[PDB]
Amino acid sequence: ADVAGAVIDGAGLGFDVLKTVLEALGNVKRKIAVGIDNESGKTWTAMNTYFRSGTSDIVLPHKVAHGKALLYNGQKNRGPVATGVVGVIAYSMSDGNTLAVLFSVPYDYNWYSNWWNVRVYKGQKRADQRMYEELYYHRSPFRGDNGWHSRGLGYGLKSRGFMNSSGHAILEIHVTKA
Ligand SMILES: C[N+](C)(C)CCOP(=O)(O)O
Ligand SMILES: C[N+](C)(C)CCOP(=O)(O)O
Ligand SMILES: C[N+](C)(C)CCOP(=O)(O)O
Numbered sequence: 001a002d003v004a005g006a007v008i009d010g011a012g013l014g015f016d017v018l019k020t021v022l023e024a025l026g027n028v029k030r031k032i033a034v035g036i037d038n039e040s041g042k043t044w045t046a047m048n049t050y051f052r053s054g055t056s057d058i059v060l061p062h063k064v065a066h067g068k069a070l071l072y073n074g075q076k077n078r079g080p081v082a083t084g085v086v087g088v089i090a091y092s093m094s095d096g097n098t099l100a101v102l103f104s105v106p107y108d109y110n111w112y113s114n115w116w117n118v119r120v121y122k123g124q125k126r127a128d129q130r131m132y133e134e135l136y137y138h139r140s141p142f143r144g145d146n147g148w149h150s151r152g153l154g155y156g157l158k159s160r161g162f163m164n165s166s167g168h169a170i171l172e173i174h175v176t177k178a
Contacts, residue, residue: 102116103116
């Protein structure tokens with residue numbers, strides 16, 4: 001089966017492949033499978049993931065051509081620590097701007113919920129705490145509510161994505177030319 005870390009045909013991205021990626025992480029309380037389909041017309045080059053909470057043992061897929069999707073994952077920090085998997089993925093686009101994707105899969109659903117977001121930043125900006133705070137608090141993230149959400153991104157692009165509500169999370173995003 002396709003694995004986290006791979007770049008696949010973007011038409012092959014879907015819940016089945018992400019479920020498999022999520023299952024392959026085994027028995028961990030909070031974990032996420034992330035798939036982002038690049039149909040933007042331009043190549044993305046990975047910069048970094050800012051992990052606010054949690055970690056990954058997967059290399060952030062380096063080059064993602066138009067027509068390809070990346071597969072990735074993250075998991076809570078090891079041991080009983082009551083924290084989840086929360087972070088921002090940042091890819092450079094060939095126009096000199098940055099594609100940023102927020103994911104948040106909190107430890108405690110009594111206080112918090114799943115959220116995600118997608119935004120293009122002007123210039124080359126590495127993912128960091130400031131970007132996490134902007135995307136989570138101020139830039140209208142979407143709830144992981146087991147439903148799809150669309151939004152135009154500017155820069156000739158639009159996004160359509162889905163995230164479920166539970167702590168074994170899947171996040172599937174398609175970035176297409178608007
Ligand atoms: C809930 N949060 C997203 C604001 C902070 C991080 O959550 P957690 O990793 O402590 O659960
Ligand atoms: C602060 N806390 C993480 C122990 C519980 C949640 O409080 P709040 O951040 O929902 O106000
Ligand atoms: C994410 N948010 C800051 C826009 C809404 C509040 O969500 P949460 O932190 O209470 O789960």
